[PDB]
Amino acid sequence: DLASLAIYSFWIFLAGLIYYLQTENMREGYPLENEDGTPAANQGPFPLPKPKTFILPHGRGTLTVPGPESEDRPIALARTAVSEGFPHAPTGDPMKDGVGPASWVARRDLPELDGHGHNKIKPMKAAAGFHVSAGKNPIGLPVRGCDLEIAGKVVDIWVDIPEQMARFLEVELKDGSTRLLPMQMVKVQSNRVHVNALSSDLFAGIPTIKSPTEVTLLEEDKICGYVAGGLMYAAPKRKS
């Protein structure tokens, strides 16, 4: 009968769908590799999917995945054991070298554009009309690090025009240079902004950006990488 025809068909459909559904989720990171870079013997049971191509909003091009995968950077790590499976120790300073929770990917060194071709993220100073509407305004507050010492002061708020959203605080250091610090990693309080991930002495190390009114995808990654990494690597100076 019908019902049992229907339910039996359904399971076959479902298995095709999982098959689908999995190969589609292979467009990045595959083929698997060995701790050295060479392709792994078992790639498992699902084949790699046929390639597909995105175009690329503003003359920016094309992307095709699956495609040759490569870190386009040196990785400073060394094995700690003679067999597959263990941690790879950092061979220098993981915050600088960009490994572990401090990693970044080599994304494109252009900034994201909104729907009209304009830089998605501008500092507030250059964003006409943008003002703070609710919540304490950080501009002006001193910035404190996880070692309870003062690293700098906020001088602007870099915002996402199209999403109308704060994305970074720009921060001025002892020497008069600035840094970006992610909104998501700071705590705005009433008489100051607080940063748990970094200690005072690590602010100078935050990657700088090249032009002072835009950030690239590559630089957002180095900045965010560098500061998440502090949670692990700055623990010795973090106190409470």
Ligand X SMILES: CCCCCCCCCCCC[N+](C)(C)[O-]
Segment lying near another protein (by CB under 8 A), choices 171-179, 204-212, 222-230: 222-230
Nearest distance from C-beta of residue 68 to another protein, angstroms: 10
Strand partners, 189: none
Selected binder of ligand X within 31, 44, 67, 212 (CB under 6 A): 44
Tally of CB atoms within 10 A around 28? 9
Q: Which of the listed partners (another protein, ligand X, none) does 175 bind, with a CB threshold of 5 to 8 Å by partner kind?
A: none
Selected binder of another protein within 47, 92, 187, 210 (CB under 8 A): 187
Q: Is 22 in the site for ligand X (CB under 6 A)?
A: yes
First to last CA, the chain: 69
- In the window 188-207, what residues touch another protein (CB under 8 A)? 188, 196
Nearest distance from C-beta of residue 99 to ligand X, angstroms: 23
The residue at minimum Cβ distance from ligand X is: 44
Pick between residue 48 and residue 165 the one whose CB is nearest to ligand X: 48
Which residue from 139, 107, 118 is spatially nearest to 213, judged by alpha carbons? 118
Burial of 171: CB neighbours in 10 Å, binned 0-12, 13-18, 19+: buried
Judge contact between 195 and 146, C-beta under 8 A: yes
Selected binder of another protein within 159, 180, 206, 209 (CB under 8 A): 159
Q: Is 48 in the site for another protein (CB under 8 A)?
A: no
Chain Cα centroid distance, residue 213: 20
Tell me the C-alpha to C-alpha distance, in Å, between residue 52 and each of 26, 63, 67, 99: 12, 8, 10, 30
Q: State the number of binding residues for another protein (CB under 8 A).
A: 95
| DSSP conformation letters of 7-40 | HHHHHHHHHHHHHHHHHHTTTTT-S-B-TTSSBP
Nearest distance from C-beta of residue 144 to another protein, angstroms: 14
Residues that bind ligand X (CB under 6 A): 18, 22, 44, 46
